[model samples]
Target: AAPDSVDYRKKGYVTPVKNQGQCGSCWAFSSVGALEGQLKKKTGKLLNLSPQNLVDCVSENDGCGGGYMTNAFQYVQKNRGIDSEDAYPYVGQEESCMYNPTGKAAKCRGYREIPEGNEKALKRAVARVGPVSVAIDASLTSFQFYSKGVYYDESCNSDNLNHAVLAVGYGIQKGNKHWIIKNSWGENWGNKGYILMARNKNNACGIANLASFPKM
Candidate 1:
């Protein structure tokens, strides 16, 4: 029987867990992961777009230092597109942009955001649209060692949130609902580099505060 809850990875809508290394390139991973989902669903081609592309190319972001997935999506629209990972591999460091307009592999006309402080709207977008790029407070020590179970940390400040991730799915366990998150901290961390965060608690840790995805 099909599960009562949604799991995008089970439906093959999610990409593999990625690591941003020591750099603050979570923005690139979150944005690219969402783009990969939409483009694959639309074209049936799973692309590993270059975070190196964003890290090196997007001026609106601080590259390895930090970034916003929103600006990364805008970068895609402005750069005419992005290149595949094999074409533009990651170096895990800041560098000059090497964007060649003719080497484009993925492009999006626009993107959309879930209303701030709305988890239901975010979940709807994930189910109806695709995987979502979201920001959260992953700096908490509770998040640092989150191996399993629905993560809930009173220490996670919604107003002072940091870190980017993808909301690939959601599920309910014993009346407790959670959002399945894919992080950019590698497959070795957490549950194979994923975390299940509490859902529908007034945007806990800002998980639903900045939910967004590409509009193909």
Candidate 2:
């Protein structure tokens, strides 16, 4: 079946961390930001994985504040494993680790960086692989609670930048190209935890940066 045909709802893509409120951990939020899908794929159970675990566990960098996806993935891999959300629920605020005497663990299977903002490559990758990690311009009010709309724009530059999401799939909507994107901002945010982007529109929120595991 065409990737576009895949039921994203059944596939279980999600939104960005909820009510980041005033946190500056956009980087950390974006990092491992797709863990819900990762865990779902691995366990077949859609889990609201925790970014706080990452925020609290990952060392050698600023915690509960800022960090890169690459670094975050590395931390996950090295830490061997991160506790589920039940173990460390997200409070939308940064805080120091209170538990854990265990040392760093082994790296995850692997991680990869998507090829810039190439949508075609991204689509192909998603078709061949699974969900792809991406960085987008979450600064737009439209994106704040965006449900469904055509992302018509020529410039990729936007100001409100402060979040990260994942591209779960793509398809046509009302005869226009649209990307089935997953956010990390919790379920009450957009379209019950998802959003759509113009597949042919502006950088498609840099979907090209959609990375995968096992680094191709």
Candidate 3:
């Protein structure tokens, strides 16, 4: 059964962003995911953006392979400027942080955590404000998804918290409601660059349940 707080009737899609693997750069991916959605909302053009730029440039104590979404945004605001996907292409997991000499750096607005993973707050923020940086249990079989399917699991623990994703939008599908989730595993993985997680049971992964938002 769907959670009482979450309605399965809403339709949403998590914006898309290039993926970075084995780099311990989940933070970078999470930040870029939010940036991509924000850029699209502002320009009406979906920019792929760059995770590599963050990995190679941001000097926020947490090395290229490790960091948080907040720190990644700081790195983008301080060092290399964030740009559209065309400006920086995702080349997968690699140890190369060649700074973009021409890129212009921007200041980070701030970072915020959604109290209790409130979906109402998240929807309000993403739909009216911008994309939300959300952390999820990528460790679930449903999370390991590389294609179309219903990911319904009821387990939560440290082992389940393996990755993070961006919450772009929400919507209804096939009589069932789901949240449009964008993952960092790459286009080849998940619902053709995204995932359809049961919005009704999203709290299982603390998805719309507990989330964070970064501003810049």
C-alpha lDDT score of every prediction, in listed order: 0.86, 0.59, 0.61
What's model 2's lDDT at 144? Answer: 74
Q: Stretches of candidate 3 above 4 Å error?
A: 1-17, 43-45, 61-64, 83-98, 105-107, 156-160, 200-202
By lDDT, is 1 or 2 better?
1
Structural similarity to truth (TM-score) of each candidate: 0.95, 0.77, 0.75
The prediction achieving the highest TM-score against the true structure is 1
lDDT of 3 by residue, 1-216 (tens): 223232211322234435565567776777877766555545555546667777666677354456667677766666536754455555555455676546533335666777665666666555655557777777755567547865556665423455677766666677665666777777888776777766655465767654666564
What is candidate 1's lDDT per residue for 134-192, written digit by digit as tens?
A: 99988888889888888888778997768999998888866789898999898989999
Which ranking of candidates, highest TM-score first?
1, 2, 3
Question: Of the pair 2 and 3, which is ahead by TM-score?
Answer: 2
lDDT of 3: 0.61
The per-residue C-alpha lDDT of model 3 at residue 200 equals: 50
Ranking by lDDT: 1, 3, 2
Q: Which scores better on TM-score, 1 or 3?
A: 1
Off by over 4 Å in 2: 12-19, 26-30, 98-107, 158-162, 186-188, 210-216
